Amino acid sequence: NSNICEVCNKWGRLFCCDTCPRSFHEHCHIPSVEANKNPWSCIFCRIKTIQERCPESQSGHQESEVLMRQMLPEEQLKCEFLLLKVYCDSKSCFFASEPYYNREGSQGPQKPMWLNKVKTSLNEQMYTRVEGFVQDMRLIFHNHKEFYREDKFTRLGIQVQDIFEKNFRNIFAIQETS
């Protein structure tokens, strides 16, 4: 197995996947690595299994249909994995914890949002459809773009949104377009 966490790329107290060489800190894995379970399969393996069991799940889909899906166990897992893929990028640090807004010439957003809040929300089964999760994730980046205006720091929102959107299209097998 790897000797660094797959998400944060640091060593420490790591849990090893039994079906692939990935390793994780307890709370870097989403969901948090489970107490017992020998063997244990990580989220990457669990997602691969879903795809392998239903190869047709990789044919293209319309985003509008995906968003209306209820959060049954497989859709719950897919959103957990999508959230984890964002945390895997080091630029996610900027969006992880609760922001505050005090900049001359800008007003804070009406509805602040951050990754750890989305994480808690998923853990607590607060989203009934994929749409709820996706709206909160997109809101993180939209709030950032709006607040930072022409400061070059706005680009961090663009960058992390692009990681989100690429992984959304991959995980949910969104139909490719130009």
Contact residues for Zn ion (CB under 5 A)?
5, 7-8, 17, 20, 22, 25, 28, 42, 44-45, 54
Q: Which is nearer to Zn ion, 43 or 134 (CB)?
A: 43
Considering beta carbons, is residue 90 or 106 the nearer one to Zn ion? 90
Of 53 and 111, which has the nearer Cβ to Zn ion? Answer: 53
- CB of residue 115 to Zn ion, shortest distance in Å: 14
Burial of 8 (0-12, 13-18, 19+ CB in 10 A): middle
Q: How far apart are CA 111 and CA 118, in angstroms?
A: 13
Cβ atoms of 58 and 174 closer than 8 Å: no
Measured in whole angstroms, the distance separating CA 71 from the mean position of its chain's CA atoms is 15
Comparison of 60 and 103: residue with beta carbon closer to Zn ion: 60
Report the nearest approach of Zn ion to the CB of residue 12 (Å).
7
CA–CA distance from 3 to each of 11, 34, 41 (Å)? 6, 19, 17
CB of 141 to Zn ion, least distance (A): 23
